[PDB]
Amino acid sequence: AESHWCYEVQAESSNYPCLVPVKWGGNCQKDRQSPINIVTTKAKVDKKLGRFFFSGYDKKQTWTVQNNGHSVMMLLENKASISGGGLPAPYQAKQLHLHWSDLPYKGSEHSLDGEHFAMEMHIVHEKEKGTSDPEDEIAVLAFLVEAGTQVNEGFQPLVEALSNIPKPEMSTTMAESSLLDLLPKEEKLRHYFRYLGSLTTPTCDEKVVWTVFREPIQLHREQILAFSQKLYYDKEQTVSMKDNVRPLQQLGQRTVIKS
Ligand SMILES: CC(=O)Nc1nnc(S(N)(=O)=O)s1
Ligand SMILES: [Zn+2]
């Protein structure tokens, strides 16, 4: 490529040339890409999609959180894992990160029935393989975030940490907190959508089994704004981190199923 990959907002907000999403390389131009719009009434029920088992999600830890230049990322270091959820194996948690905007009607990568949410949180896990790379090497759990007036206390350790990592490659330690602190109530997580796709940043490898939960996380408008107010794409701090969102891709001949 002739320059570093970026999101559209970065190219629009700076005179420094970068490669916008439609121009991304790697596998980004192949035909099983993510994110997608989900028509919820067209997704077929698959009874084999049962409940998830979240392991290590309840435990209070002091997570390392970092600005990687295109998101904020918690390092999960195999300290959590998942099974069930119609998955073919257990998966080890690697990192958690987010995509957002600063307007309530956009910020998520996926849309449900043409509606974008204020943020989307991705928990990235790796497959525990056997002897028999695969289409489902990575399991990403996607949670949509709806802006409101409810202060989400569970999110405060993360939101407070943001002031400490404004620039790329900066890391800090979050106050004691659990992954469940960040999620909707567990019982609400029985309803989710499932399809096979890609990572949503270069090289956009087609190795992700996606889960998009129906239940949104409720976050106060100003907790969401704290992301774009405190974070930057560059050490120069010329472009606030927001609209770190890949445009919608075509489902093509794929099928979306639901629990
Ligand atoms: C470092 C790493 O895990 N790569 C990721 N790239 N895109 C991802 S996402 N947005 O689809 O969850 S994760
Ligand atoms: Zn992501």
Side-chain angles (χ1 to χ4, degrees), residues 42-61:
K42 283 186 182 198
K44 279 264 197 285
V45 165
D46 183 340
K47 278 160 196 161
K48 289 163 175 155
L49 299 187
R51 62 159 289 187
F52 281 88
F53 296 88
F54 299 100
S55 287
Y57 272 66
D58 203 33
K59 180 163 163 59
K60 301 296 197 182
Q61 309 268 187

Side-chain angles (χ1 to χ4, degrees), residues 7 71 95-99 109 120-124 140-142 199-201 210 244:
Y7 295 104
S71 190
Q95 46 116 335
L96 176 156
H97 66 260
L98 296 97
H99 304 262
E109 292 211 299
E120 185 171 328
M121 188 174 80
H122 288 159
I123 316 178
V124 184
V140 178
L141 302 191
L199 298 157
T200 66
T201 60
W210 278 98
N244 56 345

